[PDB]
Amino acid sequence: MTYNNVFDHAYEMLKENIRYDDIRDTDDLHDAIHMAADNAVPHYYADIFSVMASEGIDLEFEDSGLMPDTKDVIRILQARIYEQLTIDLWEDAEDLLNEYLEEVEE
Amino acid sequence: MTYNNVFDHAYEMLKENIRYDDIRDTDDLHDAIHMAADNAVPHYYADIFSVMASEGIDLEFEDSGLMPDTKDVIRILQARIYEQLTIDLWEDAEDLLNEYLEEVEE
Amino acid sequence: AELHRQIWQIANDVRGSVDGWDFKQYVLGALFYRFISENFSSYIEATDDIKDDAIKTKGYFIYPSQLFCNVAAKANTNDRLNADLNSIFVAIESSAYGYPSEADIKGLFADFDTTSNRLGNTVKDKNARLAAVLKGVEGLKLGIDLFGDAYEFLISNYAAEFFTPQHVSKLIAQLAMHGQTHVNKIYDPAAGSGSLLLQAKKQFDNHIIEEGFFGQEINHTTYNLARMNMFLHNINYDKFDIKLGNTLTEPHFRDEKPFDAIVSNPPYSVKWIGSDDPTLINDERFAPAGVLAPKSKADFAFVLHALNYLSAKGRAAIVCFPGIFYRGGAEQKIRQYLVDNNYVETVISLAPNLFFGTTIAVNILVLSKHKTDTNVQFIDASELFKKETNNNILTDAHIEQIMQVFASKEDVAHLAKSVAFETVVANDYNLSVSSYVEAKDNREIIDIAELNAELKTTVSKIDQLRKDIDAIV
Amino acid sequence: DASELFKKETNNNILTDAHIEQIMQVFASKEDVAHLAKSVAFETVVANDYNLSVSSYVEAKDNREIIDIAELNAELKTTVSKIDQLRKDIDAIV
Amino acid sequence: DDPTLINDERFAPAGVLAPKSKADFAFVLHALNYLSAKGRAAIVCFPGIFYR
Amino acid sequence: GVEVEWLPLGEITKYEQPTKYLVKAKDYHDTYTIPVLTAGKTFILGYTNETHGIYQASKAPVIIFDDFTTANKWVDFDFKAKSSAMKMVTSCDDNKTLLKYVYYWLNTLPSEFAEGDHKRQWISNYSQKKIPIPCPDNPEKSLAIQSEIVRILDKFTALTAELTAELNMRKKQYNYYRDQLLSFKEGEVEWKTLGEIGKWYGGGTPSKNKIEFWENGSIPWISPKDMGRTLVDSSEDYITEEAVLHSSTKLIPANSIAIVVRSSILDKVLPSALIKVPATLNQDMKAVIPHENILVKYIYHMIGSRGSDILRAAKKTGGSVASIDSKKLFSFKIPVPNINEQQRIVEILDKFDTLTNSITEGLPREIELRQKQYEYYRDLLFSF
């Protein structure tokens, strides 16, 4: 139950979205990133803790505003997972600007 | 790296304190509970997450005031571990009101 | 910087294609086989033929077996074995690790290379994977003898569990030093890696060469990688050893000697059943403690071990958890026996985190059989370049400042200083309370912060009146 | 439904909550309830983008205030605050 | 589909067929198959359907 | 105070652990009655008060929070709970202490009690010493000369309480003033769809992967960790002027507004900010500009009065971190009146909320400046 399992799910789902929607505008591509992102995060307690004990993702932040100012701890953890996945989907967007859209020409 | 490993450490340390201090007043017994409690909690990231993915302890609360109103997540998790261990040391105090102090009479 | 980014990246590229802890053994084994293949060849050429042959003349063969004691062959090295690309089968290298670890003459430091194994699911997949490993190690390029320094990077794969970051190790090395140009250095209980020993005298090889870096370590697989860790850095054969086993239960050497410098990094939560489970309450070394340490607080066992193997000239630079108030009566009298004499010299706090996920800092206890005498509770949190440690890879030149102000008994503000010799007996033997100098010192003037609010309220009254008028639209 | 739906636990009423009883009961005959859901139009969702759900989601926490009850009390407290400012200006000399 | 079950026996009235990660709505397309006119189906799903 | 002397803390204090607490049934709804109080903000929602071993918090004990924190002070004012963080500080003698006095004295040691540094319990720290006492004037005129200063401190603590109360009631009346006025505008005021007030922009976000795009720069950055304010003029994050080579941003003018559309709404109420320097924002919030038939404060406060309405009709849009849609926030219609009813009513509304709110011409800034001089006058009085 690594971080990379969740990232593989997000990578596959983003490939599904770009492959089946043919999105070639980067802002709509990042809207599809927002589509895939929460649709790839886990939901169980032990799964989220086993992802948070894994590599890649860190407890530290990129934006503290994504934290809801509330006492809902796994909401904050899932927001942190969301944040690390949005960064890794910036990297995946840099991959898929040149991965799939180039072959589809017929 | 269960919750019960940490509880066994706390149980052993509380036995050490009561056995070597001969505390027979319950308020000082609970001060020794506060002594053993933070002295038994783990410190590493992956250890705390593996305890939080285990049984017994739950993400839900007994007192939300133990949460520090801050963005330090594993401080909040370690406070939750502290809280569940204080409850389980109420139970351990009920055990050790009659476990060891009765035999020591010479 | 020089080539470290490229070597960094190509070393991280090897790490496919399944979990890295199990592949770590194989990657380091293949790298070490490459190093012996370079070293033994570069020895015996010291000159005409790269490609050797079975011309061994084995009366000559005992001379490097005494000189080096890794005496493999002339046709079974990594330059020679990795010419057999995808050659059935695997076990040739398991034979090619059989004999070079035999070499029983004399004083082995072998019984070593037994971490390369077989899994794997099928034997053809095992052959393909080990050929991929030797391929990737072949892909590493030297292009003069710091090729093993990338090893120091690669054992830092997880730390970016317990393998002691490098500049803190340089601090501990500068704390076991100095003013002591004396055989021998050095000792270490629970070395783990060979690192914090290695960054002592690798910088101080040109200074002095005395004797071995005597260590004892518990884990079996850590033992092998430590014994090659100090083997890669051109340390010689005879003295430079680690003994397997627990330091507490089976210490050796007892006899040799009260040392001149010990360093350590005992791991947290290294418990052992007591108190004692044997009759070592009346042992040879823990008798001056009075009481002995329980299970979960085994860290202060090490310091009771520390003052044993140390001469009057020696000093000890160990590390501990910060959370000592007096730790109950089980360690209050232990702290008392430490402050009973001039055993404890100084303590040093550190900056959180500057580790891999603790997220706390730790304390450094510096001990000596040496008399001045008052304690310098020489804490620090900053600076202590807390921001990172990625800058100044070579030297921070910052622990330089720390050691410099440690060196001659200063009394500093906005940084720690000395205290009284009986301040801590006035304390409840605490670590630390003094000095902790009182930062963020601020207060205000009397009435500058009220007349402005008074003027804003005078604006607020006519705004209330405009509010009462403007409500009718 | 979000409540109730005895959200507090489910440890009470191990045998039957008798609460899904109420839910099934109001499901049973085509009601139209407030502070709980109801029926909608057969073509409301073709007017929607085929969503699940938007309607009805009935509009809880409905509150507003009176015009000037919440200002004259603050005005009186500011009239206290002016003489407190004056006592502050006097009492600064000790 | 990975097989030729785009032209299967039961998913033909759907028109398109469900991808990998959104397999939940495969079940409901399976659900109306094995059910008479008298029958009714009580299934559960994730909430997050806007139009997917 | 003629004879002012230092006294130890544990001489006149019974400091204890609480009684048997049983505060968790699995609901603590508003319909319960006891004041439940812990550290941080001293109000957790209510609980059933009767028959739980309740200490019931009589006339003048006080409390302290917390283990490892050791800073917080509260008076149990009339009758309160004991909710499992309230380590009790009281007295055994009540003829000398009158321990609202010791609350009024004890908040004058910031030299060590404001140091959250270790995981350390500090019972002896605030247990032993010291406290300023007018001893040996006991019990004749010891508290009698302290009656002037308990008048001072009761009225000043009451000033802080009533200022918070009047700021609450002021924002209350102002929130209803935003919605009684300025709404249902007749007749008939033109319904303009949002975005037709002006061509507004999407966003734009780099990462920290290049240090040269992050270190220096004079263009500010608007992220939701600096949002929630009114009239934002600068921020904590500045972005590099070169880094708009790889930012996917646009230069917005010097009278824009910034509105958050993610991570705040679907649970809370979205804020908005007039932004005055040209500053760029990230993917999940919107920079809105008006155009030529407008007034930027009127469209600002029009969205600010109708913030709870733009989060309702498209509330869910999938159960995710995605929220009220970009198009479904784009397609809202607002009343835009004649040119006599933009600048007048927003002159009223800008006027009144720069009265009621932070920072300049601010009532809570007056409150914290009164807190500052409260601390200073306690600093000035309690010396000898």
Curated annotation (Swiss-Prot), chains A, B:
Name of the featured protein: Protein Ocr
Organism of derivation: Escherichia phage T7
Database matches in InterPro entries: B-form_Ocr, Ocr
GO biological process, one term: symbiont-mediated evasion of host restriction-modification system
Function in brief: Prevents both degradation and modification of T7 DNA by the host restriction-modification complex. Structural mimic of the phosphate backbone of B-form DNA that binds to and completely occupies the DNA-binding sites of all known families of the complex type I DNA restriction enzymes. Thereby, inhibits the restriction endonuclease activity and protects the phage genome as it penetrates into host cytoplasm. Inhibits host transcription by binding to the bacterial RNAP and competing with sigma factors. Inhibits the host exclusion defense system BREX.
Annotated consequence of substituting residue 49 to D: Partial loss of inhibition of the host exclusion defense system BREX
The keyword Membrane belongs to this UniProt entry's keyword annotation: no
Subunit structure: Homodimer. Interacts with HsdM (AC P08957), the M subunit of host type I methyltransferase restriction enzyme M.EcoKI; 1 Ocr dimer binds to M.EcoKI. Interacts with HsdR (AC P08956), the R subunit of host type I bifunctional endonuclease and methyltransferase restriction enzyme R.EcoKI; 2 Ocr dimers binds to R.EcoKI. Interacts with host PglX/BrxX (AC P0DUF9); this interaction inhibits the enzymatic activity of PglX/BrxX through high-affinity binding. Forms a 2:2 tetrameric complex with phage T7 OCR.
Phylogenetic placement of the source organism: Viruses, Duplodnaviria, Heunggongvirae, Uroviricota, Caudoviricetes
Alphabetical keyword list: Early protein, Host-virus interaction, Inhibition of host innate immune response by virus, Restriction-modification system evasion by virus, Viral immunoevasion
Curated annotation (Swiss-Prot), chain D:
Domain of life assignment: Bacteria
Region of interest: C-terminal tail: 65-94
Signal peptide: none
Entry note about domains: The C-terminus is required for assembly of the restriction enzyme complex. The individual domains assume different positions in the enzyme, allowing the holoenzyme to regulate the methylase, endonuclease and translocation states.
Family to which this protein belongs: Belongs to the N(4)/N(6)-methyltransferase family.
Additional detail: Type I restriction and modification enzymes are complex, multifunctional systems which require ATP, S-adenosyl methionine and Mg(2+) as cofactors and, in addition to their endonucleolytic and methylase activities, are potent DNA-dependent ATPases.
Subunit comment: The type I restriction/modification system is composed of three polypeptides R, M and S; the restriction enzyme has stoichiometry R(2)M(2)S(1) while the methyltransferase is M(2)S(1). There is an equilibrium between R(2)M(2)S(1) and R(1)M(2)S(1); the latter is methylation and translocation proficient but restriction deficient. (Microbial infection) Holoenenzyme interacts with Escherichia phage T7 protein Ocr; this interaction leads to the inhibition of the restriction activity, but may still allow methylation and translocation.
Job of this protein: The subtype gamma methyltransferase (M) subunit of a type I restriction enzyme. In the presence of the R subunit the complex can also act as an endonuclease, binding to the same target sequence but cutting the DNA some distance from this site. Whether the DNA is cut or modified depends on the methylation state of the target sequence. When the target site is unmodified, the DNA is cut.
Protein name (Swiss-Prot/TrEMBL): Type I restriction enzyme EcoR124I/EcoR124II methylase subunit
Native source species: Escherichia coli
From Swiss-Prot, chain F:
CDD domains: RMtype1_S_Eco540ANI-TRD1-CR1_like, RMtype1_S_EcoR124I-TRD2-CR2_like
UniProt-annotated stretches for the region Target-recognition domain 1: 1-141
Region annotation Target-recognition domain 2: where it falls in the sequence: 188-337
TM helices/strands, residue ranges: none
Name of a matching Pfam family: Methylase_S
Protein keywords: DNA-binding, Plasmid, Restriction system
Statement: the UniProt record of this protein carries the keyword DNA-binding: yes
Renumbered residue ranges of the record's region Conserved region 2: 338-384
Superkingdom in the source lineage: Bacteria
Keyword DNA-binding annotated: yes
Region (Conserved region 1): 142-187
Comment field on protein domains: Contains two DNA recognition domains (TRD), each specifying recognition of one of the two defined components of the target sequence.
Cited function: The specificity (S) subunit of a type I restriction enzyme; this subunit dictates DNA sequence specificity. The presence or absence of a 4-residue repeat changes the sequence specificity; a third copy of TAEL inserted at position 179-180 changes the recognition site from 5'-GAAN(6)RTCG-3' (for EcoR124I) to 5'-GAAN(7)RTCG-3' (for EcoR124II).
Record family assignment: Belongs to the type-I restriction system S methylase family.
Other observations noted: Type I restriction and modification enzymes are complex, multifunctional systems which require ATP, S-adenosyl methionine and Mg(2+) as cofactors and, in addition to their endonucleolytic and methylase activities, are potent DNA-dependent ATPases.
Subunit structure: The type I restriction/modification system is composed of three polypeptides R, M and S; the restriction enzyme has stoichiometry R(2)M(2)S(1) while the methyltransferase is M(2)S(1). There is an equilibrium between R(2)M(2)S(1) and R(1)M(2)S(1); the latter is methylation and translocation proficient but restriction deficient. (Microbial infection) Holoenenzyme interacts with Escherichia phage T7 protein Ocr; this interaction leads to the inhibition of the restriction activity, but may still allow methylation and translocation.
Name of the protein described by the UniProt record: Type I restriction enzyme EcoR124I/EcoR124II specificity subunit
Gene it is expressed from: hsdS
